[PDB]
Design a protein around this ligand. Structure first.
Ligand code: SFG
Length: 245
């Protein structure tokens, strides 16, 4: 019998993403343009307190997908209100966490968690057991597409320094807000070479109004370009399905 292996246990939690043919940047820009043109009706129909934020439960699902590793010294980059840091603190205590964010957003997590008020694009890395990053922003419709792409590429370039240091993080959870840019795909491929690990996932039930994926330190899953292509094609189809009659 399959036994306990049944519970971990991928089927329910993330999209199946086998690689397919196509240009992910062209397809991503196409579906973003279509979404920008949607009516209130269309857009609304598919755009759809215990914790410091809704991020706590999200990180719990991701860490379970990773077989619940021991976290050790952890940096939480772009910590915001602290949902991810609070999860780490509940798991292992406050001592091993450093939270980095621009609080200029107020901290809703344990005040015992060490915090650094800094731009993650300026802060230089240090050696950690676990690297967490939940930065990234979806832009509103009125703006040009390349602006959103460049903003999120810049954040990813900040994470790159943490990943490429001489002793990289053993565990990592990296939010990829815009995964179909040339830079995002090149960065993910590079981190797979550096670490020998890493799989890009789309979480089931994430909002269709965004293009968010998560890069997780589970076993290597390669062909990232084709899997992003599959993701953006399927996303455009599910946006169409939801926005319609
Ligand atoms: N360049 C930057 N440096 C530091 N923090 C940033 C930067 N850009 C955005 N942020 C912050 O990153 C946060 C992103 C949030 N999604 C984090 C949520 C957090 N994971 C939670 O569970 O509550 C926002 O609070 C932003 O204020």
């Amino acid at each position: 019998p399959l036994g306990s292996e049944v519970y971990k246990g991928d089927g329910y939690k993330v999209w199946k993403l086998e690689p397919s043919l196509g240009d992910p940047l062209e397809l991503g820009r196409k579906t973003k343009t279509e979404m920008n043109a949607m009516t209130h009706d269309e857009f609304d129909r598919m755009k759809y307190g215990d914790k410091p934020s809704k991020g706590y439960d999200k990180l719990r699902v991701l860490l379970d997908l990773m077989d619940r590793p021991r976290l050790g010294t952890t940096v939480d980059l772009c910590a915001g209100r602290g949902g991810w840091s609070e999860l780490v603190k509940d798991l292992e205590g406050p001592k091993g966490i450093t939270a980095v964010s621009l609080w200029e957003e107020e901290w809703m997590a344990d005040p015992a968690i060490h915090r650094i008020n800094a731009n993650v694009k300026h802060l230089r890395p240090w050696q950690v057991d676990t690297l967490l990053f939940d930065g990234g922003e979806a832009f509103k419709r009125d703006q040009n597409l390349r602006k959103e792409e460049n903003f999120n590429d810049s954040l990813l370039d900040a994470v790159d320094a943490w990943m490429m240091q001489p002793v990289p993080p053993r565990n990592f959870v990296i939010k990829i807000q815009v995964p179909y840019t040339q830079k995002a795909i090149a960065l993910l491929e590079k981190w797979q070479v550096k670490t020998g690990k890493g799989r890009l996932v789309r979480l089931a039930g994430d909002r269709l109004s965004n293009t968010v994926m998560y890069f997780l330190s589970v076993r290597l899953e390669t062909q990232i370009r084709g899997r992003v292509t599959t993701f953006v094609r399927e996303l455009a189809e599910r946006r169409k399905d939801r926005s319609l009659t």
